[PDB]
Design a protein around this ligand. Sequence first.
Ligand SMILES: OC[C@H]1O[C@H](O)[C@H](O)[C@@H](O)[C@@H]1O
Ligand SMILES: OC[C@H]1O[C@H](O)[C@H](O)[C@@H](O)[C@@H]1O
Lengths: 830, 830
Amino acid sequence: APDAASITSSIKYHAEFTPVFSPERFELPKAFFATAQSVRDSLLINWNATYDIYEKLNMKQAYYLSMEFLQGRALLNAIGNLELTGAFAEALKNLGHNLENVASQEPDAALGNGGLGRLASCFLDSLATLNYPAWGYGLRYKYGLFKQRITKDGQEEVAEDWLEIGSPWEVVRNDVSYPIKFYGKVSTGSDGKRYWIGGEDIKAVAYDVPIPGYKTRTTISLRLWSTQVPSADFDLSAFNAGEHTKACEAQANAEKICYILYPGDESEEGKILRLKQQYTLCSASLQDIISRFERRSGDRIKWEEFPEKVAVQMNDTHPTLCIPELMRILIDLKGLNWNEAWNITQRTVAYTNHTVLPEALEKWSYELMQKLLPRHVEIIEAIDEELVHEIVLKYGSMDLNKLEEKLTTMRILENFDLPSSVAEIPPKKVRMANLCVVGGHAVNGVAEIHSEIVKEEVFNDFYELWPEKFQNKTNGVTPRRWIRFCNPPLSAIITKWTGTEDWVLKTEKLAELQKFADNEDLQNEWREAKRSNKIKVVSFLKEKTGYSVVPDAMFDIQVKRIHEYKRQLLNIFGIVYRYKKMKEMTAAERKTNFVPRVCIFGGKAFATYVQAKRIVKFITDVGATINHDPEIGDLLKVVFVPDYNVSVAELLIPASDLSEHISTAGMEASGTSNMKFAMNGCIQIGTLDGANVEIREEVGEENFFLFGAQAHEIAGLRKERADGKFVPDERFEEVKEFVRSGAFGSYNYDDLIGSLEGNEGFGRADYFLVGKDFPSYIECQEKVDEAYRDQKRWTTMSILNTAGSYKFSSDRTIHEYAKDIWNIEAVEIA
Amino acid sequence: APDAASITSSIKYHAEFTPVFSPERFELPKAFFATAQSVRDSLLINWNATYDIYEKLNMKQAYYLSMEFLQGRALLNAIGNLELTGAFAEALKNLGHNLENVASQEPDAALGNGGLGRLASCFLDSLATLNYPAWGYGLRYKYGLFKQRITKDGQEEVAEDWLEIGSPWEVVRNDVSYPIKFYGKVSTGSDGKRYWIGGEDIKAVAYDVPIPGYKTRTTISLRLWSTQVPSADFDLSAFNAGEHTKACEAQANAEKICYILYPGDESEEGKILRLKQQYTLCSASLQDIISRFERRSGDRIKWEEFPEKVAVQMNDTHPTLCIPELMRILIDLKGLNWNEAWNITQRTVAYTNHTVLPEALEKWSYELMQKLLPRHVEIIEAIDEELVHEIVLKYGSMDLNKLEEKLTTMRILENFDLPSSVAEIPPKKVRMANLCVVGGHAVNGVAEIHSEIVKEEVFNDFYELWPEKFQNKTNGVTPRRWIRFCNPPLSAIITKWTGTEDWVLKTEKLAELQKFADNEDLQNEWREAKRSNKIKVVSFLKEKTGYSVVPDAMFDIQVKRIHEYKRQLLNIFGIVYRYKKMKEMTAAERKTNFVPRVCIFGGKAFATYVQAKRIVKFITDVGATINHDPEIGDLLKVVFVPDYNVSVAELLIPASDLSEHISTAGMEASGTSNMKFAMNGCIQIGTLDGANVEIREEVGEENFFLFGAQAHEIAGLRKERADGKFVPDERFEEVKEFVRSGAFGSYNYDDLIGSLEGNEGFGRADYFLVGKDFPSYIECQEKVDEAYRDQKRWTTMSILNTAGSYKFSSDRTIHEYAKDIWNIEAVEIA
Ligand SMILES: OC[C@H]1O[C@H](O)[C@H](O)[C@@H](O)[C@@H]1O
Ligand SMILES: OC[C@H]1O[C@H](O)[C@H](O)[C@@H](O)[C@@H]1O
């Protein structure tokens, strides 16, 4: 275990000897690079320790596969979990730098996008920390999604450049690479097994990222696959010929798999690439797992032991191919027969949902998947047939309607025939979500109410057939990154009033703040802390949004994928209402009615999704005018933070007073931002749905602001729109007209209101009930103004959010996965 | 300065902490990787030392630009020059490995091809060793030329894979990258200077490879440029659209510059790429140099000082663009006017000619170059005009014919007009060799007789105008790589019979072997050593050529570009003659007359060059039959070594008895293989030309086997063929018929002999006088048989070759460059 003295040397060493810059000066990016290399060294000691202990013990290991990991930045949580925070700070002093400066150089790992990505990253922290043998498998996306620029003209995209110099935290494993095949033909050989020959051949090379646990040695792995083709494949004859672009083809169409995350699938080309990406992950991962299982088994190898040595968690329907791919490996390659392979598959694999609505579930073209993964469609089919037979045996051909209905609901293959049937152009499709719910031994939703839908609607029939499979694993977020490290002031207070530093682990200790929520001394330190955080954010918003703002206003934050269902538009409209009102009142009354706010927006809109980009533009103009109005001044600001990601969240969240989770009700499965917020003492306005429902229950009904129509009514209210019974509120009408008047200027918005107006239509009719929720919304916002004025009350609510957030530690989530699905036990590393 | 104890730790560290493999086992490639990382560390100490001393002193630095660097393997010369050879050996013991094993894992740096490449690498060794402030600039070719496979069907190409895992010896410098532009337009701005806007934009990122000097700290650099485009440029809109291959375009056509060396220029596309490669090097290099000059200058900066602080050596006509490119930087960017810029340019830049014949000299399409490099053709033109004016001022308008002739010979622009002229469709071309001979202050050839041609033929008229410019710098090769490290047995003997280990530096000490060339004791140790070396080669030829051979035969080596001018088939034909003869005589008589031989062939043929590939096939079949003939057995073997490169040379050369340098006379400028051979105690058969002429003079006329028509006669003898006077030797006729008979079997040869036969024609007529030299050749080969039998005589000759090779140390060459062209002095590093 080192100290500042030793680390100063560790960094000097790496700067000189593991260099990526010239020796001219020790600038900031040099300093970061060398610092991170130092940290790795430490991480690799513990990584190899964990590897050894895991090898010897050959215990059950678990495997979280995710199309996205939103790792964020590594340094601060790294030296935090290694407890060397102090030492690195002091080390850098000696070398003419400081920690925060250096931490600033590090780009977020653009390995993910949203909550499903973050949930993965949050889970890893929990697993390492809790000493559970588990790894994460993902793709190594070179250019992420995009770097968001907020130009005068709204949002614009650029390729993320986080790998320009390369990531210091990663370890390439040139001996870990697997073969991945696409297209081709299948032929049965004289052993009676299938052989999948021909098509395309690419390699998947492993890059390990060490995840360290807090106050433990357990250092697990995020193994990231990266695709290429062996240099053999470079076509010399063609290159020398003159066909350079031709000569590249194999490498071009191999690397492209790992270029970007969620590549636009309007083209067939894009759908192909998407599928490539899913399979690559499922394949290269399972092959690595299987490899490791064998190694650890030795001479004495038994495939009955595989599910007792391995569990695979499919994060959504993207990893679905794990089911047929494992089948494929167990049968075609390892030799086992259908029953053995299938039994093992189910015992191993499990599905985590993440999606509410049935049309949000991933489906594929049968013809497409057939062309790309012949062998896999074969197996899929066999499973579907297996299934029709299950569905028929249980039930039987009573009430043909019952039977027939069930068949179409549950079948994996949409628009297909039955191998035999009784009873006395449609595009052929493959339902990945069905495959998952049959292939896995466990299906779970991500919050009470989410897991309820899946049970009683989305997979209703599968609940009937296999009730045992359905459970729930309410989401969480890591206390380390989201309290201890993102918000040190908060931490000092917590540690104090609890009496140990142990809440970081034993986070049920937050509840011990309840008896002190009224204590005025505690409220003082609380406000002082929040403020402190806010003062940091001021400087941030200055450099990033070029708008100067005041600490002493309320911080009202909404940060999520920009989307009509997320309804940032409802929020900005509530902003515009307050603005219209404030103009219609003199200076003095203006200051009396509305509490000062800084309204923070952020998050990305998919480049193709026009309305969403229109929303980004809207907000940016609202802010343009409002923030440059001598008449308003500092009573209202509206900023949009460019390129929202983990770094930003780590900064805004600690300093938030109010945060908005105002999705149309019944649509959000869970959400995880809202947990980070409640943890950081923030108060939540939102609809009743997803995690919001539990957070409210835990924090306190009166310490969480609620509004809007509830999930069950929505169809009622849309029906109301469809018939023409929704009478809009006059305040709603006001806002729209006020904008039309061109208050925000030369950009015309008729399109944007366009979406909301009319009773019928694809794009018309306000599917997401902005107009309908709007009244209770703004009135709720009045109750926040009101609450904020009563700072003794406000601050109590703040403290109660934190003291209620404990259940939302991902540590609780992982224990539950680990005990109830994976049956993995903790391995302690000496 | 470390020891085995410390290095064991250094390697353990790197294997674990700078890893590129998983922690599972310490295999060979792991062991090599970690070992090399260790060595780097040492190299970087001394690299940074050299950098500091150079910075402070800001003395004249020199710069060797080469389209190719044939670095080979680094490890053995690295730990050799650092004198840590012992320590690394012992270190590896402790870790369950041995040095040679580990050295075997390292691929040769595929950064070059031929002698001009090797000469560069050899020069670097000399410069570091002799403490001269100089660097090397080259491109970082990802896939080299090709990996040569010698299949049943002859030679076949594969892309070199030396960067699959990446090179441990390189240091990326992410802060060292320059902008390179192609195409575009030029417009004059309001400052009166030219502005080269638009076209293509790519980055050139530096990779440093440390060259350590023997028994010094001076550690210089081979800075290798590597091209790419900033991740910004990745077209998201297009990728998400579906046009993946489109989205890549910029990166594809940026990286392609550094894909392969000498990419086939049959296509226009290929010519474009070739030019791109030359410019990239000239530009990115000069920008780095200029940058460094400025840095070192500080506030007090004077461009008159530039040529007194810098010299640029253009290795052949590939770096020609350095002249206009420096002009461009000095004028358009830095602001200086024509005269200042030009004077500096000439003072800085110098040309080394590596080419005999005038049509072997590099020319370009005017239209091509003035689409890609507009600004550069402008400057070129200005220089040519400057030149016409020079040519006219010296030489009055007296002899019109004289004047007009001269104009067309010396002008840079072939098939152009004169800005005004007196006197009372041809494709427009640009002559890079002329540009070089005008732009530089120094032109030099690579051997006496080569430099004589350039003076008195190729640049005859330029000799008249600027005699001072012409000198000679006879080639050399490094004693370190080519005696001390490739051949340790030889070294032990040398060190012994000389007083000291100092010959490695003070290599004139080899001459001390002359007294003692007769000494029988020395001859014993000599033969013992040679043999030892040969025993290594036996095992090598076994694994790579799959032919078992005996040490006790004579080793007859020919290894060079496979080419009709290099002959090769004269030798293989001389091989076939001996074979035909041996069959026509009984076992017993056969074993007199012919001494046992192993005839080694090797080297690559360009994939397009059909005849050359036909030659590779020929040899491989000759060997096929001969080596599988119970009747011959071990009196004759013929092998072709696949993938001849530095590693191989290092192995064959020490173990050679005879080596062949039998190019058609007057064609070889120099050659460098023949110097490494004479150094290693080998005896040379060859034609009178290139370095052969000096080697013979130095080693001793009677210790070098000579034959063939001499350089002056060739045109005589070709004229003789053209008229039909040649009259072939009956022995020549024999061989051809014997092969025709299909002795070597099912592959039909005709068309191979096809080249040699006939008196007129493109492919006919034996341009290279195989048939004509053949008689003296084979008869000379008889004199080798004869000499080899007299082992006292033979071995004396062997020893005299070594004792004569001293003048051929590249150390002598570099001193000469350094004193006579560069005016650089040695800087000692404390
Ligand atoms: O469960 C992880 C996340 O996945 C989805 O994208 C949902 O929108 C959200 O409800 C949830 O937080
Ligand atoms: O000098 C460098 C080398 O360049 C060329 O490859 C010539 O063939 C050779 O004569 C010379 O040794």
